[PDB]
Amino acid sequence: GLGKG
Amino acid sequence: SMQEEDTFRELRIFLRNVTHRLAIDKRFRVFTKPVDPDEVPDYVTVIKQPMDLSSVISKIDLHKYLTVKDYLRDIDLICSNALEYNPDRDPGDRLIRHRACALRDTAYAIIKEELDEDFEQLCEEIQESR
C-alpha cells in the first residue's frame, strides 16, 4: 500500500 | 441507578486494563497512537474511521462504551483499517496485517478468559433500557 513514509 | 453506574464503572476499569495490556505489547506499538496526519496525509483520505489504542482509552473515559461488544467493534476497526490501508504482498504490509490480526485475536482471547458472560449480559440489558 501507500505506506507510512 | 447508582448500581448501574457502578456496573459501567467496572466495565471501564476492565476495558482500560485490557487496552493497557495490548498497548504495552511491543508488537502493537504501531497501533498505540493515531497515524500521524502530517506524516501520512493520505491516511485520512483512505481510512474513513481511524482508530488506535490511545483513542480507545479516550473513548472509555468519555463513557462511549457501555458494553464489551461496543469496545470490540473499535478493536475490530483498528484491525480492519490496517488490512485495508496495507493490503499488498510486500513484507511491510504483511507484517502490519499480521500484527493487526494478532491485536484483534489477543483482545478477543483476553475477553474470552476474563469477561464474565453475565456481566456482559447485564451491560447489554442496561444499554438496551436507555
Residue numbers in the entry:
A (entry chain B): 9 to 13
B (entry chain A): 979 to 1108
Paper passage:
All ATAD2 orthologs share a characteristic N-terminal AAA ATPase domain and a C-terminal bromodomain. Additional functional studies allowed us to characterize the normal function of Atad2, and to show that it is a general auxiliary factor targeting acetylated histones and facilitating chromatin-templated processes by maintaining chromatin accessible. However, in contrast to FACT, Atad2 bears a bromodomain capable of specifically guiding the protein toward acetylated histones where it could act as a molecular motor thanks to its AAA ATPase domain. To elucidate the structural basis of the ATAD2–histone interaction, we co-crystallized the ATAD2 bromodomain with peptides derived from the acetylated H4 tail.
We previously found the preference of ATAD2 bromodomain for multiple acetylated histone tails, and we had observed that mouse Atad2 preferentially binds to H4K5ac. Consequently, we focussed on H4 acetylated on K5 and K12. Hence, the purified ATAD2 bromodomain was crystallized with H4 tail peptides monoacetylated at either of these two sites. As described for other bromodomains, water molecules occupy the bottom of the acetyl-lysine binding site. For the two acetylated H4 peptides, residues R3 to G7 and G9 to G13 are well resolved in the electron density maps (lower left). However, apart from these conserved interactions, which are also shared with the binding mode of the isolated acetyl-lysine residue, the binding mode of the H4K5ac- and H4K12ac-containing peptides outside the central binding pocket is highly diverse. The H4K12ac-containing peptide forms only backbone or water-mediated interactions with the ATAD2 bromodomain, and the hydrophobic residue L10 adopts a seemingly unfavourable position next to a polar surface pocket (lower right).
